[PDB]
């Protein structure tokens, strides 16, 4: 057994997802707007040869807001909608086809040196049956790297591996707002339309890995 060092490039690409559920009734009320895990598949090219990779994006530490426009059978409420802000995290899994990810079993140390990215939000229409429709638009946040975590599950003499990246968050210049309401000009990124009609987001950087490998 012997210790080695692996210094490679990395590009990670990801998305968001959501779920929107109404309540039963006359059609004026809404119960949930929340995040949901999403996954993506791509190929990119290092110095020598192309590599195919996978990601899975998730979230934690979620702030949840609400709106209550009275109590009648014909009024606009939102029971819960979620938003990501300073007290929250973004989790991204990553596993690759390359020769370097075969030696990520017995890891001594691991560091990563990525750069930041900004995610901004789009717009969403609340389609009431009768009347003008309120909209929810705006919001922005930026992502900064905060550590790497490896985990294993033990199931019948076979290990099941994962590699997760952490990202802390900081609010940015556009505020979000909900038209035809009193709710006024907050910061953070809601889950109405996170992707803003993009195919993916992108972060590039490098990492350094030290691990025990079996010596020939």
């Amino acid at each position, epitope marked *: 057994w012997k210790e080695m060092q692996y210094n490679r490039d990395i590009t990670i690409r990801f998305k968001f997802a959501n779920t929107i559920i109404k309540s039963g009734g006359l059609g004026y009320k809404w119960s949930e707007i929340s995040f949901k895990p999403a996954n993506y598949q791509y190929t990119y090219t290092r110095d020598g040869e192309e590599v195919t990779a996978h990601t899975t994006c998730s979230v934690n530490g979620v702030n949840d807001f609400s709106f209550n426009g009275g109590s009648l059978p014909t009024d606009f409420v939102v029971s819960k909608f979620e938003v990501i802000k300073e007290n929250s995290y973004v989790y991204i899994d990553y596993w690759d086809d390359s020769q370097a990810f075969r030696n990520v079993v017995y890891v001594r140390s691991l560091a990563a040196n*990525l750069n930041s990215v900004m995610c901004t939000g789009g717009s969403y229409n609340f389609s009431l049956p009768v009347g003008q429709w309120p909209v929810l638009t705006g919001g922005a946040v930026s992502l900064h790297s905060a550590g790497v975590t490896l985990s294993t599950q033990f199931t019948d003499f076979v290990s099941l591996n994962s590699l997760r990246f952490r990202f802390r968050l900081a609010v940015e210049e556009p505020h979000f707002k909900l038209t035809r309401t009193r709710l006024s000009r907050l910061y953070g990124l809601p889950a109405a339309n996170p992707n803003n009609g993009k195919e993916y987001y992108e972060i590039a950087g490098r990492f350094s890995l030290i691990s025990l490998v079996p010596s020939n």
Partner: antibody
Amino acid sequence: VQLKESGPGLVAPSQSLSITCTVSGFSLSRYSVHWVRQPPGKGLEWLGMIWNIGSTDYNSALKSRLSISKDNSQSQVFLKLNSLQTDDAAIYYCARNSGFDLFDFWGQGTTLTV
Amino acid sequence: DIVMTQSHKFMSTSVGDRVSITCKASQDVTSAVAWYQQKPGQSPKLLISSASYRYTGVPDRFSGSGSGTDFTFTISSVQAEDLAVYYCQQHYSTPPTFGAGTKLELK
């Protein structure tokens, strides 16, 4: 944060070089440091990088000459470069990494005559 | 080895007007270009980190834009202190590469 270079200033051909960059205001176990240079009448060129733990990247053309080490306790990082030619006359800088390759804070710089 | 090429080496401008400085890339660098400034007898200073994102202690008259391979750096109104040299860096791949350098001459 402050960075400060200190070098010989005059060296003969086919000799060595040693520059010491003493840092202040931050820790070397949290951040990572670069080295660059600028020849007269030419643009800037990248030389190397030392990581948080002991780990180095180098330039491909000058890989077989130079080496970078550091000391965490007495907060100072030093460079070496051997068997140098008359092309190597430049002003050497030590700078701090912030993001991926962004050079956040720069030093004063020492000049080399050969 | 992505090559960053600035087309000009000198710019002439007056005391209040617009200045624009450009540089191209050899490959596709997806919005990962920084900008620097070096006043006479100093060290360089970071101004724009990404292709548009300004830094904290930078005046409001500096800005930047661009995507793909073409990139710009603008000043809305000049002053007498803006006489320096400017650089465009790429921070997308493993060796970071600088541009040539464009001196600004105030007329």
